[PDB]
Symmetry: C4
Subunit: 388 residues, 4 copies
């Protein structure tokens, strides 16, 4: 009934409480579940949904052969309430795409599915199901967006789309949609920044996004912008390196990509800035995508220290992990006066790691809570391989 308003700070967060695990892949052992990847959560006022880029096939099937590759005319974005296995039975259709992002402005959903050829892909802006606008690749190299939730404030929604090479320098645009209508955009001038798959969240008029450098950064690049899109960038000061792969935590930088041989690649991640401090979600292995923890250098957003301030384990480094996102839960839903930060973790299974013919993922998600919390490990839990 009412729109998500602006001007609200990320509530106090002492520990992450488990919101929901979905055993997607475990149920797919013998159930009718979609082969997935690239999942992420997003809430509106009443319903919180899990979105995902379907490989257009179900687990334990001959059509799941090769689900290791991203992009195909088959890849389709779809939603489902949190915690439930994403099956053709509860899965609602959202868009045709192999990369995308969706958010809500409160009472309605915005869906940005980017499908089409590598050479000249197209974003398709849908609002509550209806196509409302489009955007075509401008640099001609895999236009691609967040692969996570976008943020909306006062009728207006924001996101970020990259387009360039994975190799080195690419190009970045900030959109400002309103009812699915692209009402403006700015070309970000970030020399030496590889920006892509951003994990955003609103923070008082502003919109803060921590993303990934898949060019030469072992730390994360960030970007905070206006209602008009006047930006501000750099990387996360902290030495508790978030990317992956990443080197042993050294002294970090706050404006350049810390290479250290490992920077060269990366994986989607998030982070919440709390003043001078910042909560950092990161994998435990430094070479592979396994395990997952939520750090806490309180000097983190401004200091290059490597000294952290406390860790809550989420997945021991004995199990697999993957894409880490970061949606938010507004104060229109919560009787509260501050936005609640929450995050979900994708546990990838199958290739290129495990000896299977398929590659999909599971998921879990925790929230803010300024109460008590315990750590652990809530992995996928699939006994692999399958009836392959």
């Amino acid at each position: 009934v009412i729109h998500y308003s602006s001007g609200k700070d990320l509530c106090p967060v002492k520990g992450w409480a488990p919101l929901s695990k979905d055993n997607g892949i475990r149920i797919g052992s013998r159930g009718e579940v979609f082969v997935i990847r690239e999942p992420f959560i997003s809430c509106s006022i009443n319903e919180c949904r899990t979105f995902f880029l379907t490989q257009g096939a179900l687990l334990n099937d001959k059509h799941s052969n090769g689900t290791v590759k991203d992009r195909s005319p088959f890849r389709t974005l779809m939603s489902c309430p949190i915690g439930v296995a994403p099956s053709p039975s509860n899965s609602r259709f959202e868009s045709v795409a192999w990369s995308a992002t969706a958010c809500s402005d409160g009472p309605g959903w915005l869906t940005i599915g980017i499908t089409g050829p590598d050479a000249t892909a197209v974003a398709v802006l849908k609002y509550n199901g209806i196509i409302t606008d489009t955007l075509k690749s401008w640099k001609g190299n895999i236009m691609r967006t967040q692969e996570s939730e976008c943020v909306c404030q006062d009728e207006f929604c924001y996101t970020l789309i990259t387009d360039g090479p994975s190799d080195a320098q690419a190009f970045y645009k900030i959109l400002k949609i309103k009812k699915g209508k692209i009402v403006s955009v700015k070309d970000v001038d970030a020399p030496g920044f590889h920006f892509e798959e951003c994990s955003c969240y609103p923070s008082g008029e502003n919109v803060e996004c921590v993303c990934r450098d898949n060019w030469r950064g072992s730390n994360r690049p960030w970007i905070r912008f206006n209602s008009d899109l006047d930006y501000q960038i750099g990387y996360v000061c902290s030495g508790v390196f978030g990317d992956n792969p990443r080197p042993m935590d050294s002294t970090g930088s706050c404006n350049s990509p810390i290479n250290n041989g490992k920077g060269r690649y990366g994986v989607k991640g998030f982070s919440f800035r709390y003043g001078d401090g910042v909560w950092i979600g990161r994998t435990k292995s430094l070479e592979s995508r396994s395990g997952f923890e939520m750090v806490w250098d309180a000097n983190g957003w401004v200091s290059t220290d490597k000294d952290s301030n406390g860790v809550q384990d989420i997945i021991d480094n004995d199990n697999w992990s993957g894409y880490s996102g970061s949606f938010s839960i507004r104060g229109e839903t919560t009787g509260r006066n501050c936005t609640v930060p929450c995050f979900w973790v994708e546990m990838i299974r199958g290739q290129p790691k495990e000896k299977t013919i398929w590659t999909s993922g599971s998921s879990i998600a925790f929230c803010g809570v300024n109460s008590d919390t315990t750590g652990w490990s809530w992995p996928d839990g699939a006994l692999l391989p399958f009836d392959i």
Copy 2:
């Protein structure tokens, strides 16, 4: 809450954006999906549904043996939201029939399922589930309707039903239903016109329908009628032949069926008239039903030229295609002031082409959008045959 009103022109269309693909058949590889064929989309104010003539069985089953033939006491029309696999779980029942058409007048659905013996079939008019009227075959040779969406304007809905031989001359009626009540009908006087499986859409008081000549036309027959049903017919002037099979594009006619040896048969198709121009959806092969593109002779509706004005590829001619429809999205849904034309393509799989014991189809759908667009190929994607 409000009725679909009349007097609205097909919005400006620069390129077709992908609305939704459903991997129906791919999910049926191991999922619980209905063996289908004859699908088509249709929207109302809130929900857009996909309708289809079920073979009364599920894919990869012994009861899917022979799904190649149309018509049976088993064939049943059913709906489901767009993009989702049409399974016994999300599929809603609509009518008993092996041919039909359904539309909305805005707040409610109209369903016309025609079932019964070849010799004396019956149409059954249901409105929001309730039987409201009926119509029996009058010429005694497979009464059959659109096999696509019908159009409604100002409480009143319109459709077209054929009844005659596939061989040559058949007979055609224009209905005018209101709340499922057949409030009038006209016998179309079209000497030398094989009219059937019409793809309609509203265009300002009027109702334009491009159909198929399965008698001796390699081009498409059309028909525009009133609120009172005073019609106007002929074929599409353009030389960019729409039927299939069809001969190489020669100089076309605008009132007679261009035979050229191939005319003899055909397949359902659509087309949107934009003044002197017209958007033409057609298969790439000329002998088989494979591939699919959306043409654009701007002189097309009035000129017999074969010179076209631009092509957006939808399915390379390397994959299968099939029935091509053409629903519309009114301006009551879209805040806009003009109806948005959209179309769906059926990709048929199995017989009579492929070495299987079954025959079903998948689907995709794109919309207007006066923005940018890219072409490609979004085929079914089923690795055939099956566990047959």
Copy 3:
């Protein structure tokens, strides 16, 4: 929002139009469908549902072994919208029982599931899910009710429950429930009447029910009662014998059971009285339950003639049939001023007839319609046996 009112005559009925077929069993070939039997339809103002007595198992399963017998602590009554396969996915729970009846008073559903031991069974009155009342067997021999829809008028609902031997004389009660509360009941004094599994329908203050004599009647016993329950009985005058088994149509009686060797048994059936005439639904075989047609002696309700007045075939006698019911569609739903009579036919498959380890059923349903109609045969369509 409004209650089903009384005082309305069964609309004019020229022919039966097909409302819905569900290929229950055909989809169960490989789908997740419930092993059923004893189905029947029932509508309320918005939704029409199909109810059924589940064998507490799914088709093609080892737990479907013996589904030939009625009654078990497993048998559970459940609903689902018309036309859809009754699967654990769309099937809504209704009650624990191996015999029952449910109806609506317009805005709410009444459910009467009778479960428990043969010796001392209990009816359980639930209204919109909540238990509201109960009734225990009074004669101690399988208390059992309609096994079809009951009728409600002006806040009040009515049904019929038998209790006695199948062998000969049993006992019958007429209930009068209101919001699931049994507000009165009468003991029917029908010497020489075997009354059970009644197919009812409202007809102007009154409630007419045609049932079955499984004692010594080859024709059907009827019963019309008041708002206070003052009854009137006898059998259907007509010579077009409805029971099954039944002898060749001879001259019938209107108050006694016509034995003729075959009377001894029977199967549920229905019939609609239209003044002096009456529509009769009956099987084609006289020894088995196969085929199904809808007769029409217009002198039928009062005359003992065997001369009929027209037949619409529903299922050739080459396929199986079974329980035949008879719900109604009120005028609160239909803008009309008269109730619309409709009926559903159960096609039983498996034992004791076919060489299977299971026994379930499918269904179809047609309605009034004072328009044109065609006959045919819309059988189950299952290729048996199964993966048994």
Copy 4:
């Protein structure tokens, strides 16, 4: 629309009527059903749901190997309407936990899922899906709650959480939540009381809970508390011993745990106090968890007699049983002026008893009803083992 109010007595109960059986496990024979355990019902004003602690896998699957053990990062609490098989298709997600309790305050649901390591588990308070509060283990030994429904009165909800050894003395807290916000708590001082898995219900300002002594009680411990939490404890006076295992009914105590060699263990149970009398639900075997009946010593709550006053059989001791719960149905739903007591019985299948690699459970539930009733046996009904 309106909150569940307080001050209402458990309506008169002559016999238990069957509300719903779900053949969970039987449908899982070949259906897509969740491997479950720890189920229990809970109603709100409109919908009654069944909740359960999923083993994060489906029956007849390799991932159901070991479902015999409680607790795992996979165990997740989920709901579904009563009577339906708890499958990934109708099962709604509720929380991440291997122990929990949920209730309604009328218009909304409260969910308390306790997940995490044995050493330091955490309760997570969610209200209508949103995390609203948390509580961490305080004694560091499997914090665990009711494993059944909690009670809410006048905006406020109540429950009970244990934390200590199964061996002997543990510790107990009474919570008082309001909109998921823990607004107070009391540490129960029960020397010599093993309190856990309480079966509660409201009874006029007060909240009565009968639980289980898994330390040295063969009878059940109880606890009645205020709006402020001023408690009162002891055990059930009656000699008709409720725990299990339990010794032959001797003369009972009303404040201490009756050991008798068997007390040492136990299984969840319930009981409703009706003045000086009390309805007792208990297993028939004394060593195993098989069969189930509902006793009635009318002198029971105050007298140590072993003389009972009537038994209604629920499951002969030839079949398996398990956890027995006890939710309630308020008078806001029932037009009535008194709360209706109802109970559900879990029939466990598989290990440690049966020769299977899995362990799950089915369920049934009956209600108050001051009418007639019959006894019987409505067991799971699964033919074991499975395709194991």
